[PDB]
Amino acid sequence: SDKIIHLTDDSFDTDVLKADGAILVDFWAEWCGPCEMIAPILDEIADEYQGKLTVAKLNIDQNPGTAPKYGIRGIPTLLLFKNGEVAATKVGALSKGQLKEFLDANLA
Ligand SMILES: [Cu+2]
Numbered sequence: 001s002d003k004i005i006h007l008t009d010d011s012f013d014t015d016v017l018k019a020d021g022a023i024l025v026d027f028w029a030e031w032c033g034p035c036e037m038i039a040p041i042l043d044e045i046a047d048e049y050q051g052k053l054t055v056a057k058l059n060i061d062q063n064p065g066t067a068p069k070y071g072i073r074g075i076p077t078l079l080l081f082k083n084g085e086v087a088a089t090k091v092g093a094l095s096k097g098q099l100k101e102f103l104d105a106n107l108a
Pocket residue numbers: 001002003004
């Protein structure tokens with residue numbers, strides 16, 4: 001938790017679109033089993049990728065406006081942002097191994 005950014009629809013532009021460096025955004029919602037599976041995986045990734053990546057989370061039941069703008073369908077959906085643009089997309093729950101391979105491939 002501590003270094004992971006809790007996003008709102010208000011702050012999304014400043015925190016993600018204007019941020020320097022890669023930001024991985026987790027679009028999640030309440031009552032979501034797959035969302036709960038990857039939540040400790042992302043607290044680990046936040047520590048292991050420190051200096052290379054910032055992790056941020058946006059709960060769509062409390063923040064209904066940003067996800068329609070990115071065409072989000074399945075929840076959870078992870079979007080890797082770089083310089084304000086969507087660099088890569090992964091949707092669905094995945095293991096720690098799969099997430100590391102996805103990040104190592106795309107942080108290049
Ligand atoms: Cu922490």
